[PDB]
Amino acid sequence: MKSVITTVVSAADAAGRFPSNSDLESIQGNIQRSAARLEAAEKLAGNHEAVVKEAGDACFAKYAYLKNPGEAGENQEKINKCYRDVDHYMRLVNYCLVVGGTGPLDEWGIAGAREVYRTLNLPTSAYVASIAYTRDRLCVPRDMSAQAGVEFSAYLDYLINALS
Amino acid sequence: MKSVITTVVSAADAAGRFPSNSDLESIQGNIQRSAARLEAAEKLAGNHEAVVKEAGDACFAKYAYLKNPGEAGENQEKINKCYRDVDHYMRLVNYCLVVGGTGPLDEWGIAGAREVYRTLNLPTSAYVASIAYTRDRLCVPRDMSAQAGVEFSAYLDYLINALS
Amino acid sequence: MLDAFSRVVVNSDAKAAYVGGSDLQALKSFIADGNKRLDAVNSIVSNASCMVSDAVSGMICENPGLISPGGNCYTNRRMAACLRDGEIILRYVSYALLAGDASVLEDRCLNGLKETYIALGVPTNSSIRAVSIMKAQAVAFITNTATERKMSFAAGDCTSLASEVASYFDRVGAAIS
Amino acid sequence: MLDAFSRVVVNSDAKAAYVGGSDLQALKSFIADGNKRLDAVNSIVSNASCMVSDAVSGMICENPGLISPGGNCYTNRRMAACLRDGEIILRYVSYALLAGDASVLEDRCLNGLKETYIALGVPTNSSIRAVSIMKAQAVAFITNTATERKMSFAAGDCTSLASEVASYFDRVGAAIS
Amino acid sequence: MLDAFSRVVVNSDAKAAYVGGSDLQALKSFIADGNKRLDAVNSIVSNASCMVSDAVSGMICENPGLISPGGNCYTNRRMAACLRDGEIILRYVSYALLAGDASVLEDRCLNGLKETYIALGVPTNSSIRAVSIMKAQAVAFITNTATERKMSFAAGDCTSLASEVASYFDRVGAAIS
Amino acid sequence: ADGNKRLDAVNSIVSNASCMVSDAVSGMICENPGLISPGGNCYTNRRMAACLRDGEIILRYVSYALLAGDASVLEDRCLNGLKETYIALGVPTNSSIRAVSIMKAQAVAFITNTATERKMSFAAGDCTSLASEVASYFDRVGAAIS
Amino acid sequence: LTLPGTAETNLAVPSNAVRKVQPYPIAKPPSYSSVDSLRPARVSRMDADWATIYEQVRRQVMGNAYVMEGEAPDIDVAFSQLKGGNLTVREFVRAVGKSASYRTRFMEAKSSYNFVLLNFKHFLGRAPTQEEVSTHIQILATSGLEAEIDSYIDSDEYKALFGDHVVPYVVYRGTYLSSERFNRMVKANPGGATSDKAKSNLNMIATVAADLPTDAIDVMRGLPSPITSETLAFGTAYYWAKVEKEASEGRSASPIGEKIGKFDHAPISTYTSLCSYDKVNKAPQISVTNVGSDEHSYVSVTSKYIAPDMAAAAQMLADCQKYKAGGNAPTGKWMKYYPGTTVNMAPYISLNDTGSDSSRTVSVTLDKVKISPNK
Numbered sequence A, B: 001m002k003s004v005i006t007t008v009v010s011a012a013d014a015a016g017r018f019p020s021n022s023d024l025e026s027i028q029g030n031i032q033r034s035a036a037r038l039e040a041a042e043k044l045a046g047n048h049e050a051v052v053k054e055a056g057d058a059c060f061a062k063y064a065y066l067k068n069p070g071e072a073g074e075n076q077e078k079i080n081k082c083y084r085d086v087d088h089y090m091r092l093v094n095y096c097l098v099v100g101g102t103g104p105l106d107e108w109g110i111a112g113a114r115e116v117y118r119t120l121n122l123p124t125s126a127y128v129a130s131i132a133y134t135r136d137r138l139c140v141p142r143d144m145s146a147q148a149g150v151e152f153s154a155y156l157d158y159l160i161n162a163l164s
Numbered sequence C, D, E: 001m002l003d004a005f006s007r008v009v010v011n012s013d014a015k016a017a018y019v020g021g022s023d024l025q026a027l028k029s030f031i032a033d034g035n036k037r038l039d040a041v042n043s044i045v046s047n048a049s050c051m052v053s054d055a056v057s058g059m060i061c062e063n064p065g066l067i068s069p070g071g072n073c074y075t076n077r078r079m080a081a082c083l084r085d086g087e088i089i090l091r092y093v094s095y096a097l098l099a100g101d102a103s104v105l106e107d108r109c110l111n112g113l114k115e116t117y118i119a120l121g122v123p124t125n126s127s128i129r130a131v132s133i134m135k136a137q138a139v140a141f142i143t144n145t146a147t148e149r150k151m152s153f154a155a156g157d158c159t160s161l162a163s164e165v166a167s168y169f170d171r172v173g174a175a176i177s
Numbered sequence F: 001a002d003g004n005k006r007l008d009a010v011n012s013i014v015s016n017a018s019c020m021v022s023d024a025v026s027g028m029i030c031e032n033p034g035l036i037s038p039g040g041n042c043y044t045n046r047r048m049a050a051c052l053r054d055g056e057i058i059l060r061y062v063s064y065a066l067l068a069g070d071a072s073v074l075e076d077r078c079l080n081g082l083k084e085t086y087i088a089l090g091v092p093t094n095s096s097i098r099a100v101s102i103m104k105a106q107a108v109a110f111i112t113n114t115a116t117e118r119k120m121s122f123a124a125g126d127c128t129s130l131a132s133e134v135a136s137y138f139d140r141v142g143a144a145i146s
Numbered sequence G: 001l002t003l004p005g006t007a008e009t010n011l012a013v014p015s016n017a018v019r020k021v022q023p024y025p026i027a028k029p030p031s032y033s034s035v036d037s038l039r040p041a042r043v044s045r046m047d048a049d050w051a052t053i054y055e056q057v058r059r060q061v062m063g064n065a066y067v068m069e070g071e072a073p074d075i076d077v078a079f080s081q082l083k084g085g086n087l088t089v090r091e092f093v094r095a096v097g098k099s100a101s102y103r104t105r106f107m108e109a110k111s112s113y114n115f116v117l118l119n120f121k122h123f124l125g126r127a128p129t130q131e132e133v134s135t136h137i138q139i140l141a142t143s144g145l146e147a148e149i150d151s152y153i154d155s156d157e158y159k160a161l162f163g164d165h166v167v168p169y170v171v172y173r174g175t176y177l178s179s180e181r182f183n184r185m186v187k188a189n190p191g192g193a194t195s196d197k198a199k200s201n202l203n204m205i206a207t208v209a210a211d212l213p214t215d216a217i218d219v220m221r222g223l224p225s226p227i228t229s230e231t232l233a234f235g236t237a238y239y240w241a242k243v244e245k246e247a248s249e250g251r252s253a254s255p256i257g258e259k260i261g262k263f264d265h266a267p268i269s270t271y272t273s274l275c276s277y278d279k280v281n282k283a284p285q286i287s288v289t290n291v292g293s294d295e296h297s298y299v300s301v302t303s304k305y306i307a308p309d310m311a312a313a314a315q316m317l318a319d320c321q322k323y324k325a326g327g328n329a330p331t332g333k334w335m336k337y338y339p340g341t342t343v344n345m346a347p348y349i350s351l352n353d354t355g356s357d358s359s360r361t362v363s364v365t366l367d368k369v370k371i372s373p374n375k
């Protein structure tokens, strides 16, 4: 969807012209950044249900009020729904790491998020707490390389900005 | 004008959104291709009236009929106008070598070219003969580097396609 | 529309699977021959005017019934129409070659093209020949074995991309058939 | 609109001069710190929501006349208006920082902004303060000495870009003054 | 469109008959329970957000295939779509209950709804369940025996209006069936 | 197991398969102008279009037979009862043989690269085994409509 | 952004810089238009609230583009100046067309052709003629989306119909120019739940507008006519002619064998010996692809149905007229030596030498002889 290639083809198509020299000049930027983002993608993929385990609980540590009766988490199955809800965001961030743009984020998790969580009484603050706790726990020796963490954190704080 | 940066800012502006990650991903492509195109630009610039001398005459060698009376070249001043006309195209190709896109070519030489040369009886075949003669006279040992000649010829044959 | 990177995420989204290191090497290979695809698209779009004018005249000079009155390429306006009717085809195959898959020309150019040429009275088998000539010219160009004009390239193989642009050109044949 | 590469060709076009190797090293320097500008634009647009919400609330909490009835930021609709009226400003300064010169916010955002706020009854000196806070936050962010949240960077100098985003933010001050 | 008073004049116009005192008592009865219909429409539109959010979540939690990938209510955008796709239905049934006959939702909401959901790929039997939950909630509300929240009313009968809102709810059951 | 020559031979047919049907039906008229006559069988576009389709069918049916290298598919869903449907439709059985033989004479000219209008670009050699095999396939289909 | 009160940007005509913005909205067209008494009233800038003027723009120029709050900030930046009174609703719907959120589902998602139909339906409320598309694809493909969307707003039809202060809406004009542009307009604009996003192609008016003949179906252009203009015809009679239509309007059922390219095929009883009707006229479609690889060359085969082409057959009949009027042969009493059709007949011999012994073959067939004109 909203990738690097699908802006330069849609601009040339809306102008109604051939793929010009600046248009293939921008696909060269993929060759230098894919080596950084694809290795971030599968270090995310091979470790993925760990960072729902050690980070989906941080919202409940920050917001223990929503385990009360009459709240967003009543029983255990709603907590399972919460872990499923945040695992979906972790999957979409992996999809945007491989695409090269924020294409899979917008229409799959972001577009429409404002109404559901308002209508179903889900607080976005508990979402961005769990996302931000995953953001600041990144470091160069253990987690990934120096350039993987950069846009891995950039795709995270994009979601943080869009949810707020 | 139509450069690499001015598509990625106009797309983000027409969408009404911040410069996203794919948007700064495409400016990195300039860092790898500018080193090839800027050295093509000033080897063009420091040798420029040579390649009007030895290439603006090739149209008269191919089309000697237009030095007849009643033609596009009647007297010497119209031949000076012809050399000025092709030196302008050589300047615009140098401008597009430095910009990174085909921006300075479009609205400065190409947009409107179809009417003037039809109304003032100027044959486009004699233009593209002189451009194509400068295109095929490029080679790796003498003229420029291996990657300079590539998009130097690509900006030339773009003009060849647009004039025809 | 959809590019080659975005083709695998809509396949992995159908199973709710993370894209992992088991299918990433097919993408990294696609990135590794980025310059080969990139110079090939450039070699296509460099000589694109003779590519169109040669193909339409070659389609004419084998079937000279279109030039006869009552032909579909008879008058001057219809010849101006046909010279662009295939230039759009080349313009979209150049998009599909750069994007890496045949999604950008299938719903934009090819969707609804059949009944357009049926309702106007365009002979489909002539347009089949016209795009077959363009396919032959394409594999002549991006393998650098055009006997008619040679371009300089770095040495190596390019047939993997030459079969790609061949598989794009029969989709334009199938959608009009 | 105009970027930094396209700024020198409209200067050389005024004299019919070829761009040559006498002014090319100023752009080769501009290309050399491409990654510095690139990470700086990213550091701006990463934390941009608190950048806006903090600046408008800081403009409020020094001049609490806008919250009083008859204030321009009094009601709920006008506060929703003002929260985006500066987000557009930040959105265009992020364009101007990436493009390398102040041409893209010059005629797109700033052209006609003065009489808009005059005809609407927007207090200009309050908007001066609101964009001054955004300028201070910008030089805090792209020098990485925001005491409030730190980002990781490669070591080096970035003040050449920090004066650039300062010179963009006084143009929004001058056009509204 | 057409209300209950205007329903009898298009019936009498078909025979060129004056509306007289032989059929006027059926409308005088309709006027006599004006306050009953009026409080019932108010009781519908008072708690209308939980009416929608409960019904679609109840349609989800019995058929959890829509939440699976490839489901029609899978992604976030399509769930935002479905939450309004039934809110419009409730919004038009509230019009039809107030107007007194099912003419305002017949050509405005229901005309063309079938092929829309067919061309979109919306599972019709799931939307059948989603609107029958809304019908059950409606007869729970306007009879004031919702065990979940009680509203105060003057005492009396309201079942004549409760069958009316039931007969409105299988009309869009029938229209996309 | 003739690999490359077979694939070069089918390519010389299916590429220029669009000329060959239109040249053959014009040659079919070129002998007999009473076919386009009022009362003829090659009257208006109800019938002329079915002629072009039918000339195309028996053309292609031979290229798959040549690709497979045998005449099995030319008798499976091709030919077992093509004569009696033609006498049930009332087509002239004479000029159909002429239309089939124009295809033969053109295919044997395309394979041997002896076309006066278009010189094909092949590898150096001689396709004498395949120029006669398509003649055998075309006679197989000419023996049916007789 | 540009002016606190503006009239018309880009100065296409010279006479628009003198032209002031209209102080009061343009009135109705002066024809009588019997349908208009049934249709709801127009929505101008003066009468509407800002809630309903936005709802009616989203209902007409967007179809039902089905927009969220997070989606489309760019529409609302243009709305932020309309609500301030900077620009008219004419320039506002121009600004909506140039936006990306209009592009990403109408220029993007659709094809080359019905994007033009989607523009006519969204801006002028109607459907174009074929010669109007003909001078419009030239604007769209060779001059771009921008000039194409500019060509509606600076058009006399838009200026005369909606002025500077009324939202686009479908107008019933009484006297229409063609009789076909009435019901093409009605077919292009159904009522509620329109959903231009649903059908990726519509495939129905894209072949009915594609030629000046072949007017579309009766029932599609009498479906969205208002009630009591068409009721007491829709209980049981045309109702099953409607649902059997709307089933086919789902998935965009193609009209190749219906309304265009119609061909009355021969009876099945005439070819029962040959094959069943489910497999008659299918033929193998062979694509042989050469590339100097062996790893990457390919061959493809597929049986495909071959329709008769009435366009190519019509051209062939016009070409063969030259043989019709050039005589056949002289005759005489000597015809008895050529009893049948054996005049100018000869035996054709073909001899099949090949490497295998079993596949050798000999021919003889008797046939006519004619020399080609090139020899």
Ligand SMILES: C=CC1=C(C)[C@@H](Cc2[nH]c(/C=C3N=C(/C=C4\NC(=O)[C@H](C)[C@H]4CC)C(C)=C\3CCC(=O)O)c(CCC(=O)O)c2C)NC1=O
Residues within 6 Å of the ligand: A056, A059, A066, A072, A073, A078, A079, A081, A082, A083, A084, A085, A086, A088, A089, A108, A109, A116, A120, A122, A123, A126, A127, A130, E057, E060, E067, E074, E075, E076, E079
């Ligand atoms: C493709 C992307 C994608 C997503 C992001 C999610 C988004 C999402 N979450 C929920 C649904 C939910 N999401 C949550 C999650 C939370 N509530 C809390 O208490 C915490 C704040 C948070 C977990 C940390 C809960 C509890 C529900 C169920 C709410 C309910 O059923 O009432 C629903 C409604 C359907 C359902 O019940 O599953 C949707 C669309 N689903 C998707 O398909």
Ligand SMILES: C=CC1=C(C)[C@@H](Cc2[nH]c(/C=C3N=C(/C=C4\NC(=O)[C@H](C)[C@H]4CC)C(C)=C\3CCC(=O)O)c(CCC(=O)O)c2C)NC1=O
Residues within 6 Å of the ligand: A043, A044, A047, A050, A051, A054, A136, A137, A138, A139, A140, A141, A142, A143
């Ligand atoms: C792909 C994303 C990804 C992560 C963010 C982590 C998430 C994560 N971190 C830790 C575990 C840890 N994380 C750190 C933090 C750091 N360690 C250092 O050497 C640095 C100073 C600093 C980088 C931020 C430390 C010190 C521990 C061990 C103690 C602890 O559990 O906190 C654990 C517990 C067990 C484990 O180590 O796996 C998990 C699940 N793992 C992942 O797969």
Ligand SMILES: C=CC1=C(C)[C@@H](Cc2[nH]c(/C=C3N=C(/C=C4\NC(=O)[C@H](C)[C@H]4CC)C(C)=C\3CCC(=O)O)c(CCC(=O)O)c2C)NC1=O
Residues within 6 Å of the ligand: B056, B059, B066, B072, B073, B078, B079, B081, B082, B083, B084, B085, B086, B088, B089, B108, B109, B116, B120, B122, B123, B126, B127, B130
């Ligand atoms: C910025 C870009 C730019 C250009 C490309 C040129 C394009 C251009 N050339 C000419 C004008 C001309 N151009 C030519 C050139 C030629 N005629 C021939 O015989 C040959 C085919 C060819 C030279 C090889 C001639 C002879 C004239 C003068 C024609 C005349 O005055 O009648 C004019 C009209 C104004 C004038 O007379 O100078 C313009 C706009 N000018 C520009 O400003």
Ligand SMILES: C=CC1=C(C)[C@@H](Cc2[nH]c(/C=C3N=C(/C=C4\NC(=O)[C@H](C)[C@H]4CC)C(C)=C\3CCC(=O)O)c(CCC(=O)O)c2C)NC1=O
Residues within 6 Å of the ligand: B043, B044, B047, B050, B051, B054, B136, B137, B138, B139, B140, B141, B142, B143
């Ligand atoms: C920036 C663009 C640019 C050009 C195209 C040339 C244009 C050009 N080439 C030549 C001159 C030449 N050009 C070539 C051609 C070649 N020489 C080789 O070693 C290769 C095999 C082949 C590359 C195409 C040769 C062999 C000569 C010398 C003989 C001649 O004049 O043709 C001359 C005459 C004097 C000279 O050498 O400068 C000029 C003006 N110069 C330029 O500044």
Ligand SMILES: C=CC1=C(C)[C@@H](Cc2[nH]c(/C=C3N=C(/C=C4\NC(=O)[C@H](C)[C@H]4CC)C(C)=C\3CCC(=O)O)c(CCC(=O)O)c2C)NC1=O
Residues within 6 Å of the ligand: C056, C066, C072, C073, C078, C079, C081, C082, C083, C085, C086, C088, C089, C108, C109, C113, C116, C120, C122, C123, C126, C127, C130, G111, G112, G113, G133, G134, G135, G137, G141
């Ligand atoms: C986005 C994709 C896209 C396309 C592919 C083209 C497709 C296309 N072609 C034509 C229209 C046409 N196309 C042809 C072309 C041909 N007829 C022949 O005999 C040859 C086989 C072939 C040229 C090689 C002709 C001749 C017409 C005009 C028909 C006529 O009016 O005589 C039209 C009708 C519009 C008009 O006539 O102006 C359209 C939509 N346009 C598009 O927008």
Ligand SMILES: C=CC1=C(C)[C@@H](Cc2[nH]c(/C=C3N=C(/C=C4\NC(=O)[C@H](C)[C@H]4CC)C(C)=C\3CCC(=O)O)c(CCC(=O)O)c2C)NC1=O
Residues within 6 Å of the ligand: A021, A024, B036, B147, B150, B151, B154, C032, C033, C034, C035, C036, C037, C038, C039, C040, C042, C142, C143, C144, C153, C154, C155, C156, C157, C158, C161
């Ligand atoms: C502005 C425009 C512009 C481009 C699009 C690119 C084109 C380009 N191609 C290659 C490099 C290459 N390009 C090819 C491609 C081919 N060689 C052939 O013999 C075939 C004809 C053709 C295949 C279709 C090959 C084989 C290489 C070397 C290997 C490789 O890098 O892929 C490289 C260097 C990469 C490297 O070799 O390390 C570049 C920069 N450059 C530019 O300046």
Ligand SMILES: C=CC1=C(C)[C@@H](Cc2[nH]c(/C=C3N=C(/C=C4\NC(=O)[C@H](C)[C@H]4CC)C(C)=C\3CCC(=O)O)c(CCC(=O)O)c2C)NC1=O
Residues within 6 Å of the ligand: D056, D066, D072, D073, D078, D079, D081, D082, D083, D085, D086, D088, D089, D108, D109, D113, D116, D120, D122, D123, D126, D127, D130, G001, G077, G078, G079, G080, G081, G082, G083, G084, G086
């Ligand atoms: C392309 C560039 C671009 C912009 C910069 C904005 C500029 C802008 N702002 C407003 C409109 C406004 N802008 C403000 C903002 C403020 N008033 C204050 O008291 C504070 C100083 C400041 C917020 C920090 C307010 C309050 C309104 C609404 C005025 C009102 O109706 O009360 C309007 C009128 C449209 C509308 O009201 O919806 C426009 C065009 N819009 C654009 O399209």
Ligand SMILES: C=CC1=C(C)[C@@H](Cc2[nH]c(/C=C3N=C(/C=C4\NC(=O)[C@H](C)[C@H]4CC)C(C)=C\3CCC(=O)O)c(CCC(=O)O)c2C)NC1=O
Residues within 6 Å of the ligand: A033, A036, A147, A150, A151, A154, B021, B024, B025, D032, D033, D034, D035, D036, D037, D038, D039, D040, D042, D142, D143, D144, D153, D154, D155, D156, D157, D158, D161
């Ligand atoms: C997808 C998003 C994305 C980006 C935008 C870039 C960001 C990026 N920055 C640097 C590299 C750098 N970036 C900076 C910039 C700074 N350092 C500071 O201390 C200041 C806070 C800040 C200035 C504003 C410096 C000083 C270097 C090292 C020198 C240089 O390359 O410029 C490099 C490596 C180049 C090199 O060092 O050789 C990259 C790839 N990478 C990505 O993956």
Ligand SMILES: C=CC1=C(C)[C@@H](Cc2[nH]c(/C=C3N=C(/C=C4\NC(=O)[C@H](C)[C@H]4CC)C(C)=C\3CCC(=O)O)c(CCC(=O)O)c2C)NC1=O
Residues within 6 Å of the ligand: E032, E033, E034, E035, E036, E037, E038, E039, E040, E042, E142, E143, E144, E153, E154, E155, E156, E157, E158, E161
């Ligand atoms: C602004 C909003 C607003 C309204 C819409 C009306 C609602 C309203 N309802 C009643 C009055 C009544 N309303 C009801 C209706 C009901 N009683 C039940 O037990 C059922 C739950 C429900 C049927 C659906 C009945 C039974 C009466 C008394 C008899 C009658 O007047 O119809 C009356 C007084 C008439 C009278 O009793 O003489 C009024 C004014 N008032 C308002 O202020």
Ligand SMILES: C=CC1=C(C)[C@@H](Cc2[nH]c(/C=C3N=C(/C=C4\NC(=O)[C@H](C)[C@H]4CC)C(C)=C\3CCC(=O)O)c(CCC(=O)O)c2C)NC1=O
Residues within 6 Å of the ligand: F003, F004, F005, F007, F008, F009, F011, F111, F112, F113, F121, F122, F123, F124, F125, F126, F127, F130, G288, G289, G290, G291, G297, G298
């Ligand atoms: C689908 C892919 C595909 C093809 C199209 C063919 C193309 C083809 N033919 C031959 C090679 C050949 N091709 C021919 C064929 C002919 N020579 C003639 O003079 C006649 C025109 C024609 C017979 C009708 C001959 C005689 C040879 C050499 C012997 C042989 O290799 O069979 C070769 C080997 C290299 C070469 O010589 O070019 C290839 C790739 N083979 C394939 O794999």
Ligand SMILES: C=CC1=C(C)[C@@H](Cc2[nH]c(/C=C3N=C(/C=C4\NC(=O)[C@H](C)[C@H]4CC)C(C)=C\3CCC(=O)O)c(CCC(=O)O)c2C)NC1=O
Residues within 6 Å of the ligand: C062, C063, F016, F018, F019, F020, F023, F024, F026, F027, F028, F029, F030, F031, F102, F105, F106, F109, F110, F114, F115, F116, F117, F118, G370, G371, G372, G373, G374
């Ligand atoms: C008026 C009466 C009339 C006819 C009798 C036929 C004329 C005709 N031409 C060819 C013969 C041929 N026909 C073709 C076919 C073609 N040539 C090409 O290059 C194109 C690709 C393709 C479509 C034109 C070829 C290649 C030959 C063999 C070479 C030749 O004889 O010209 C043949 C078969 C061999 C022969 O017996 O001569 C016949 C019968 N056409 C007529 O109109």
Ligand SMILES: C=CC1=C(C)[C@@H](Cc2[nH]c(/C=C3N=C(/C=C4\NC(=O)[C@H](C)[C@H]4CC)C(C)=C\3CCC(=O)O)c(CCC(=O)O)c2C)NC1=O
Residues within 6 Å of the ligand: F025, F028, F041, F042, F046, F047, F048, F050, F051, F052, F054, F055, F057, F058, F077, F078, F079, F089, F091, F092, F095, F096, F099, G264, G265, G266, G271, G274, G279, G280, G281, G282
């Ligand atoms: C699998 C093998 C296969 C075929 C060979 C064709 C065979 C074939 N031909 C026709 C049917 C026909 N075919 C022709 C064609 C001709 N009549 C003549 O006099 C000439 C010989 C020739 C034109 C040059 C005509 C005129 C009709 C009948 C059209 C009619 O009048 O109904 C039909 C009847 C069905 C139909 O056309 O609707 C069939 C099955 N189809 C196949 O599926």
Ligand SMILES: C=CC1=C(C)[C@@H](Cc2[nH]c(/C=C3N=C(/C=C4\NC(=O)[C@H](C)[C@H]4CC)C(C)=C\3CCC(=O)O)c(CCC(=O)O)c2C)NC1=O
Residues within 6 Å of the ligand: E056, E066, E072, E073, E078, E079, E081, E082, E083, E085, E086, E088, E089, E108, E109, E113, E116, E120, E122, E123, E126, E127, E130, G064, G065, G066, G067, G192, G193, G194, G195, G196, G197, G198
């Ligand atoms: C005036 C009356 C009126 C309506 C009734 C609605 C009808 C309607 N719904 C949708 C569109 C839709 N409607 C649904 C709804 C559902 N799918 C399901 O699986 C559930 C059964 C159900 C929710 C309960 C969904 C999911 C879409 C979007 C389809 C998609 O893009 O995935 C669209 C297409 C426009 C768009 O997608 O934005 C329209 C016109 N709109 C109207 O204007």
Ligand SMILES: C=CC1=C(C)[C@@H](Cc2[nH]c(/C=C3N=C(/C=C4\NC(=O)[C@H](C)[C@H]4CC)C(C)=C\3CCC(=O)O)c(CCC(=O)O)c2C)NC1=O
Residues within 6 Å of the ligand: G328, G329, G330, G338, G342, G343, G344, G345
């Ligand atoms: C079964 C055996 C058999 C044949 C031998 C031919 C014999 C034959 N020749 C001609 C008819 C003819 N044949 C010729 C040929 C020639 N005249 C000359 O002076 C030269 C000797 C030769 C050319 C070199 C001419 C010129 C005509 C008459 C054409 C005319 O003027 O009407 C006719 C009359 C029918 C017609 O042509 O329309 C017949 C039956 N046909 C057969 O069926």
